[PDB]
Amino acid sequence: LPALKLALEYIVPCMNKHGICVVDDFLGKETGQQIGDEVRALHDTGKFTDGQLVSQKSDSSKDIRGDKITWIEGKEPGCETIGLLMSSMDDLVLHCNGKLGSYKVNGRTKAMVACYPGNGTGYVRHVDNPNGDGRCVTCIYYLNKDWDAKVSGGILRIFPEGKAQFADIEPKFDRLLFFWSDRRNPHEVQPAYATRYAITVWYFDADERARAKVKYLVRVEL
Numbered sequence: 579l580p581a582l583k584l585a586l587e588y589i590v591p592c593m594n595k596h597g598i599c600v601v602d603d604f605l606g607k608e609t610g611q612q613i614g615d616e617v618r619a620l621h622d623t624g625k626f627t628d629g630q631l632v633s634q635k636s637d638s639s640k641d642i643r644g645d646k647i648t649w650i651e652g653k654e655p656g657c658e659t660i661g662l663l664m665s666s667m668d669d670l671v672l673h674c675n676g677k678l679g680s681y682k683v684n685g686r687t688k689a690m691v692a693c694y695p696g697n698g699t700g701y702v703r704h705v706d707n708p709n710g711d712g713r714c715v716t717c718i719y720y721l722n723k724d725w726d727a728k729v730s731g732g733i734l735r736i737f738p739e740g741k742a743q744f745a746d747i748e749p750k751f752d753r754l755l756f757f758w759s760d761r762r763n764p765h766e767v768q769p770a771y772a773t774r775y776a777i778t779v780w781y782f783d784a785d786e787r788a789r790a791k792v793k794y795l796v797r798v799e800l
């Protein structure tokens with residue numbers, strides 16, 4: 579439960595061996611429920627987008643939209659338990675530093691809160707960072723109480739590079755997930771038939787991010 583102990587005795591060895599690490603009961607029921615309440619309040623007050631355009635119909639009232647998102651800094655009114663989550667994620671990662679491969683983590687994104695609305699949409703197979711944009715670790719926290727994928731779908735399926743197999747991860751309440759963001763971990767979200775919430779942060783590697791600046795391209799006027 580102390581972040582350093584979880585980091586050294588579980589996350590570091592699990593990440594270095596498998597590139598994927600699942601931590602259940604990360605924050606406990608009380609805090610997890612508070613975060614759920616904050617995310618549902620965001621949803622109920624219209625703070626999410628309308629959802630990824632999945633099917634563009636000739637009649638636009640027929641369009642199908644999928645995952646909805648909102649970006650959260652962690653200090654907004656009504657988001658402070660999400661901020662607490664983000665701090666706890668940061669504490670874990672920082673207590674791994676120097677031991678997650680050869681990466682040196684020096685920053686992260688804001689939190690991306692995602693809501694799959696339960697209409698049979700998921701997320702196609704993809705790699706989070708396929709082109710060297712600086713992101714080395716993906717961290718996802720799940721909020722869905724009593725989630726059963728045989729009933730509601732929504733499994734996260736990862737295809738770790740170099741295996742004739744995949745890893746199915748249920749989006750279970752108070753579950754934290756780490757995985758390498760690059761091509762080692764292509765993954766997909768299978769169709770969700772119930773409202774499915776998750777909060778993602780990506781962590782940056784100092785070297786990769788520093789040279790991403792070059793490739794991706796700040797101008798000083800003359």
Ligand SMILES: O=C(O)CNC(=O)c1nc(Cl)c2ccccc2c1O
Nearest residue numbers: 645647692701706734749765767776
């Ligand atoms: O939610 C999950 O278990 C896994 N989700 C994703 O891998 C995922 N990845 C990306 Cl890059 C996006 C990107 C935008 C919106 C939602 C995403 C998402 O749910």
Ligand SMILES: [Cl-]
Nearest residue numbers: 591592595596
């Ligand atoms: Cl093992």
Ligand SMILES: [Mn+2]
Nearest residue numbers: 704705706765
């Ligand atoms: Mn992804």
